[PDB]
Amino acid sequence: SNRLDGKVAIITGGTLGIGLAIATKFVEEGAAVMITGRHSDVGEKAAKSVGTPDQIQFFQHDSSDEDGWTKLFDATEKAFGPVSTLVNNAGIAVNKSVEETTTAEWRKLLAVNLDGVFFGTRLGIKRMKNKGLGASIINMSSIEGFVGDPSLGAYNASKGAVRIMSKSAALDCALKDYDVRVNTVHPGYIKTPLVDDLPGAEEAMSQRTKTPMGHIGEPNDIAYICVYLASNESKFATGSEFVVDGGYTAQ
Amino acid sequence: SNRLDGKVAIITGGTLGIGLAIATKFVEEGAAVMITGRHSDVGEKAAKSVGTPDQIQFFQHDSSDEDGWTKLFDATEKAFGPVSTLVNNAGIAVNKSVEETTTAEWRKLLAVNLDGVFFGTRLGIKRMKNKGLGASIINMSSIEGFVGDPSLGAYNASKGAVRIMSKSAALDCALKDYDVRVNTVHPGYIKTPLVDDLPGAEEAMSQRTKTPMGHIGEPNDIAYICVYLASNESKFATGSEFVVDGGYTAQ
Ligand SMILES: [Mg+2]
Ligand SMILES: [Mg+2]
Incomplete structure (x- = not known):
């Protein structure tokens, strides 16, 4: 289909779940991809599973690591040429209400889910602008960027932050004619091995009072919107929020 | 008209502008008030200007100071009895795009605008739940919790964070029957001495492409919704955002 002909993408947290599906479909559509993740055993196997080194490679990185972002961009460009596309997908969760969140939990989650997305967005603008690449920054979020969950307080903070920060970046890039778009993607519940590892999680998420479709999604649901x-195709879309949630936020 | 009969309020950043107007109207309506600010020269004059120590006192505090929050709730309880009402109003600005934000600027602004609001909301829930106080946490925000501004990147992140974090807190308090409501307030542009000191600022904010009313607001516009x-009167309002913006976000 070659829908991403010539594109060079970084996908953070690309070795598992949603990130891996995005990477897989990006390679299928002609993009060269650098996936990141915390573990080199998982990451090297993931890249080889998707394609050859001319299509996809792995780079070990924690998205909260500001200095590592520079090496990640350098390694990607060395492998594949100038980066056109950044998917800020790496994220973590803390299962606590605001009330029950420790300051250590707050700082750990914000380091990945907010600081890391800031570091990637800021560097991506600088490295991606003014190169005629049709550059696109996709900031992964979730339904928790729109609605509260009583037991995801810090997570909610991080997703609301990325939702509105992304609009700021989108506007600056558009007004300055940078040739960089910035948008957010908001999955509802998505079946991954990690959800499968939590007894009863999918069953709760599939209740009609949570997901009206009565089931949860799959990683390719998020790969296709990405x-x-x-x-x-999305050259006029910037500063927008794309929800794929089985009806969660419609009720 | 005694609309805040018996209430005991903490107002962070209560020595200037919006915070001082909220403190003034709260005292008029029968609340006891502890205002915070950085500077004891400003804060002691501000409290004395509003009322007697039985009505209003000052407590020196940076809202980013986690231990100071404990001291502030203790001082307010000692002065006035159990705290019923928290206005998280302290905030700062950085006039930078996401691209042009330094990491130091990012961490300085989030420390006040996000961590401080988290510290206050978390402690407020713990200290005001289950006391029959009609407790209310008002998290101050702005139009920049809804829309991007290309030159307020970090500020946008902080306001989006507080917007959705406040919904999480509202839901958990409601579901647990804590007798604590949490809401956000979103001013548009407001005339203050700080705006008056920047030639042409009010004129630019008053252009119809910014504020359809063709003028900016005043601190009492925010005091009245608070x-x-x-x-x-607002006992059924929780998890909601209240916008007072001269039409800014309507277009
Ligand atoms: Mg090949
Ligand atoms: Mg709903």
């Missing part, structure tokens, strides 16, 4: 946003 | 939210 192909659209990375592609030049 | 009286409503602190009062038992």
Whole structure:
């Protein structure tokens, strides 16, 4: 289909789940991809599973590591040429209400879910602007960027932050004619091995009072909207929020 | 009209502008008030200007100071009895795009605008739940919790964070029957001495492409919605955002 002909993408947290599905579909559509993750055993196997080194490689990185972002961009460009596309997908969760969140939990979650997305967005603008690449920054979020969950307080803070920060970046890039778009993607519940590892989680998420479709999604649901946003098909979309949630936020 | 009969309020950043107007109207409506600010020269004059120590006192505090929060709730309880009402109003600005934000600027602004609001909200829930106080946490925000501004990147992140974190807190308090409401307030542009000191700032904010009313607001515009939210008049309002912006976000 070649919908991402010539694109060079970084996908943070690309070795598992949603990130891995995005990476897989990006390679299928002609993009060269650098996936990141915390563990080199998982990451090297993930890249080889998707394609050859001319298509996809792994780079070990914690998205909260500001200095490592520079090496990540350098390694990606050395492998594949100038980066056109950044998917800020790496994220973690803390299962606590605001009331029950420790300051250590707060700082750990914000380091990945907010600081890391800031570091990637800021550096991506600088490295991606003014190169005629049709550059696109896709900031992964979730339904928790729109609605509260009583037991995801810090997570809610991080997703609301990325939702509105992304609009600021989108506007600055558009007003300055940078040729960089910035958008957010908001999955509802998505089946991954990690959800499968939590007894009863999918069953609770599939209740009609949570997901009206009565089931949860799959990683390719998020990969397909990310192909659209990375592609030049979405060249007029910037500062927007794309929800794929089985009806969660419609009620 | 005694709309805040018996209430005991903490107002962070209560020595200037919006915070001082909220403190003034809260005292008029029968609340006891502890205002905070950085500077004891400003804060002691401000409290004395509003009322007697039985009505209003000052407590020196940086809202980023986690231990100081414990001291502030202790001092307010000692002065006035159990705290019923918290206005998280302290905030700062950085005039930078996401691209042009330094990490130091990012961490300085989030320390006040996000961590400080988290510290206050978390402690407020713990100290005001289950006391029959009609407790209310008002998290101050702005139009930049809804829309991007290309030159307020970190500020946008902080306001989006507080917007959705406040919904999480509202839901958990409601579900647990804590008798604590949490809401956000979103001023547009407000005339203050700080705006008056920057030639042409008010004129630019008053252009119809910014504020459709063709002028900016005043601190009492925000004080009046805060009286409503602190009062038992708003006992069914929780998890909501209240915008007072001259039409800014309507276009
Ligand atoms: Mg090949
Ligand atoms: Mg709903």
